[PDB]
PDB file of C-alpha atoms in Angstrom:
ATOM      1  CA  UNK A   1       8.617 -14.868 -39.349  1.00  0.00           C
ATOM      2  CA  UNK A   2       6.713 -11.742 -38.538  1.00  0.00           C
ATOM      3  CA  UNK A   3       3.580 -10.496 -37.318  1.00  0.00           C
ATOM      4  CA  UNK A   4       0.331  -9.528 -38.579  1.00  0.00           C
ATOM      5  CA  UNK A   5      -1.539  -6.217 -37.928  1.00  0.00           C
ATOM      6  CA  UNK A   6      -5.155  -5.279 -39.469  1.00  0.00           C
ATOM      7  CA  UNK A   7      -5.880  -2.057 -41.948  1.00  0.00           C
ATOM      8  CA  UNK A   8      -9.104   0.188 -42.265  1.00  0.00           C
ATOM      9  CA  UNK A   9      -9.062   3.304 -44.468  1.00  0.00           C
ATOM     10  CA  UNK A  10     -10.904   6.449 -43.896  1.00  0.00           C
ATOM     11  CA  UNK A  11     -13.067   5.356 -47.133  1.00  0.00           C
ATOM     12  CA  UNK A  12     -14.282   2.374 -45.859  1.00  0.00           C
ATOM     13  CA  UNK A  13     -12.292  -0.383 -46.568  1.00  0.00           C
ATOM     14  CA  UNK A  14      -9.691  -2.817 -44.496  1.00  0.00           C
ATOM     15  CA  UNK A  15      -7.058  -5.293 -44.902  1.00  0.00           C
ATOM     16  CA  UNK A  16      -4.764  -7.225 -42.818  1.00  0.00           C
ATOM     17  CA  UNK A  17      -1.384  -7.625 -43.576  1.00  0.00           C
ATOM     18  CA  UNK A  18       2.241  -9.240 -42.567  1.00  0.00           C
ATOM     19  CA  UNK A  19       4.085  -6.853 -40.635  1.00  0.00           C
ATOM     20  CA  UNK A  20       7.708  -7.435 -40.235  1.00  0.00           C
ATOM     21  CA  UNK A  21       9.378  -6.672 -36.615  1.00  0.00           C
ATOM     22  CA  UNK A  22      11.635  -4.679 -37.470  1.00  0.00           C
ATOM     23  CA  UNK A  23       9.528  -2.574 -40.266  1.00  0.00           C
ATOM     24  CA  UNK A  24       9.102   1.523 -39.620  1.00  0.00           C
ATOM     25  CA  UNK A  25       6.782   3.764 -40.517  1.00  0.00           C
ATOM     26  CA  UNK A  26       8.556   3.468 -43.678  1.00  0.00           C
ATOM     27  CA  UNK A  27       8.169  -0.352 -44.337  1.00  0.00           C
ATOM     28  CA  UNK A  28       4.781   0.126 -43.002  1.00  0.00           C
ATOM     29  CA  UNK A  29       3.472   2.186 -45.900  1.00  0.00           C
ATOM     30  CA  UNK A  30       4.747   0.354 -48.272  1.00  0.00           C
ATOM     31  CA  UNK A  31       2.640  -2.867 -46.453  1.00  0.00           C
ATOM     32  CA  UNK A  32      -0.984  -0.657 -46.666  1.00  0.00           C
ATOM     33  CA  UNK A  33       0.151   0.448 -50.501  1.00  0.00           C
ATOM     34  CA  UNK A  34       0.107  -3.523 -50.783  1.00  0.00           C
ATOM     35  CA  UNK A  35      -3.423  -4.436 -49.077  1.00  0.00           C
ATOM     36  CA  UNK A  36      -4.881  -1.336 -50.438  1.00  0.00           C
ATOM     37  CA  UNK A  37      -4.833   1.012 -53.349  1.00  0.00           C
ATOM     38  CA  UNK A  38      -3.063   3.885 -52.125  1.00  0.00           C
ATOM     39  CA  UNK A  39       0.597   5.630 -52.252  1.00  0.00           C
ATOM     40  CA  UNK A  40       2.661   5.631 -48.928  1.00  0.00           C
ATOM     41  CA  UNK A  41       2.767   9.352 -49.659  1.00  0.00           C
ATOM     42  CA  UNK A  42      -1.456   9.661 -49.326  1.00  0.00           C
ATOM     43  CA  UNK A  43      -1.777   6.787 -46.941  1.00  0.00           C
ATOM     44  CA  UNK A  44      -2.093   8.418 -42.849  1.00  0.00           C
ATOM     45  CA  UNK A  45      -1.776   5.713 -40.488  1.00  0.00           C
ATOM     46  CA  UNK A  46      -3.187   5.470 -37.260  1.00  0.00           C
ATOM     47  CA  UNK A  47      -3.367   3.613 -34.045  1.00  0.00           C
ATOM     48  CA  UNK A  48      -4.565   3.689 -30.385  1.00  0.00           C
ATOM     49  CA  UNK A  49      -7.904   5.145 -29.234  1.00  0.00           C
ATOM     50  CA  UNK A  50      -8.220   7.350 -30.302  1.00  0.00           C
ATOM     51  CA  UNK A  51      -6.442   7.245 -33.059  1.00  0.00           C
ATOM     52  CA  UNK A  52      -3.624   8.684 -33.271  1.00  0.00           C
ATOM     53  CA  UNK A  53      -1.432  10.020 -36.702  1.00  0.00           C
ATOM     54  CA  UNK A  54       1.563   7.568 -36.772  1.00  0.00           C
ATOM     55  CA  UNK A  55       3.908  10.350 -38.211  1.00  0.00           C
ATOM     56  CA  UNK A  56       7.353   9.074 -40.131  1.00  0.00           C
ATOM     57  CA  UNK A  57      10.905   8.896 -38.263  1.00  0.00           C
ATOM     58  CA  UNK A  58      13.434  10.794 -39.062  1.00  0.00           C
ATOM     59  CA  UNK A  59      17.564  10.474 -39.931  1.00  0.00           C
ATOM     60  CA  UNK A  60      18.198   7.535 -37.107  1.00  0.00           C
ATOM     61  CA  UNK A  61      14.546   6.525 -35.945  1.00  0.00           C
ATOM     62  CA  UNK A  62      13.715   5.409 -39.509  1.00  0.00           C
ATOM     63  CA  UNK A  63      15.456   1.955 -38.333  1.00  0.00           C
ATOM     64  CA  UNK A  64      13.169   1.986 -35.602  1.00  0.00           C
ATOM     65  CA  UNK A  65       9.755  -0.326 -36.346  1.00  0.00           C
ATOM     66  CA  UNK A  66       6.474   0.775 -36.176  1.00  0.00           C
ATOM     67  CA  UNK A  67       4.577   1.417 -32.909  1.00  0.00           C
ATOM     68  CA  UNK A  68       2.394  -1.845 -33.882  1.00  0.00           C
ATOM     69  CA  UNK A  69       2.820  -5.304 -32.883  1.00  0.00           C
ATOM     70  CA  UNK A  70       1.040  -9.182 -33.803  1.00  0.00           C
ATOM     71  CA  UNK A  71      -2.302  -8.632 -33.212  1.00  0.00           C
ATOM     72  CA  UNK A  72      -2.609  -4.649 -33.476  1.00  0.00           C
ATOM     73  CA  UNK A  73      -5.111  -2.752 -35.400  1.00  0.00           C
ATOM     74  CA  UNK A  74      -4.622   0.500 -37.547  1.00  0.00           C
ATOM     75  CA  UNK A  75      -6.443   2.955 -39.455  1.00  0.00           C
ATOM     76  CA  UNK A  76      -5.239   4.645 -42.879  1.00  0.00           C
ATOM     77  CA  UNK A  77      -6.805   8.051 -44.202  1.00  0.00           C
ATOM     78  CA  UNK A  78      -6.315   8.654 -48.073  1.00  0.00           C
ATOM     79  CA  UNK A  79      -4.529  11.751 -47.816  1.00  0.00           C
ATOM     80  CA  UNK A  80      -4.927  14.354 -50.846  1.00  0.00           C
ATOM     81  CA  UNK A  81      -2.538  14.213 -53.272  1.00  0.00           C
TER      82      UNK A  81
END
């Protein structure tokens, strides 16, 4: 039982996906590596309007879950690896 958030990369392509409640920025990459055909380490996340660049927790906020919630919408960039 989770919720579900949308996905658009820069290159012009979107998926939605399953969010859990408790997933970081961590979890979260992983999700868009799912839907989409990129690495969490070339996929840039963003959210809010504008959009914004999601960046990754560190040692004790990496628990924390991501600034999204049921119903949000996000925007990946393929980053260059």
């Amino acid at each position: 039982k989770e919720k579900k958030i949308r996905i658009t990369t820069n290159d012009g392509r979107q998926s939605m996906v399953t969010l859990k409640s408790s997933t970081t920025f961590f979890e979260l990459q992983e999700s868009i590596a799912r839907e989409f055909n990129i690495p969490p380490y070339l996929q840039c996340i963003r959210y809010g309007f504008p959009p914004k660049e999601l960046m990754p927790p560190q040692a004790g906020m990496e628990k924390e879950p991501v600034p999204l919630q049921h119903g949000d919408r996000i925007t990946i960039e393929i980053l260059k690896g």
